[PDB]
Design brief:
This is part of a larger assembly, with two copies of chain A. Chain A has 49 residues and is mainly α. Chain A: Flagellin is the subunit protein which polymerizes to form the filaments of bacterial flagella. Chain A: This is B-type flagellin. Chain A: Belongs to the bacterial flagellin family.
Chain lengths: 49, 48
C-alpha cells in the first residue's frame, strides 16, 4: 500500500471540522447564533421581520 | 491444487471489489440518513 493512503477520511473530517469552526467563529464574533448568512432561513425571516 | 488456489485468489479479489462496492453503498446511505435528519430538522422547525 504505497500509491495511495486511505487516511483521507481524516482529511474529510478535518475539512468538516474546519467548516464548523469557521461557522462557530462567525457566530461568536457577530454574537448571533443564526448568522446573517443562509442558516435557518425560517429563523432568518423571523429575525428580519 | 493450482486450480484451487487460482480460483481462490480471483474469488478473494472479487470479494474485495464487492467490499468496496458495498462501502460506496454504505456511504451513500449515510448521506441519505443525513439528508433525512435535515428533513426532520426543517420539518419540526416548520411547526413555527
Amino acid at each position: 500500500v504505497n500509491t495511495n493512503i486511505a487516511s483521507l477520511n481524516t482529511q474529510r473530517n478535518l475539512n468538516a471540522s474546519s467548516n464548523d469552526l469557521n461557522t462557530s467563529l462567525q457566530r461568536l464574533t457577530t454574537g448571533y447564533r443564526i448568522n446573517s448568512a443562509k442558516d435557518d432561513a425560517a429563523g432568518l425571516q423571523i429575525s428580519n421581520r | 491444487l493450482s486450480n484451487q488456489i487460482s480460483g481462490l485468489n480471483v474469488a478473494t479479489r472479487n470479494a474485495n471489489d464487492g467490499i468496496s462496492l458495498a462501502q460506496t453503498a454504505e456511504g451513500a446511505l449515510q448521506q441519505s440518513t443525513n439528508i433525512l435528519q435535515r428533513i426532520r430538522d426543517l420539518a419540526l422547525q416548520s411547526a413555527n
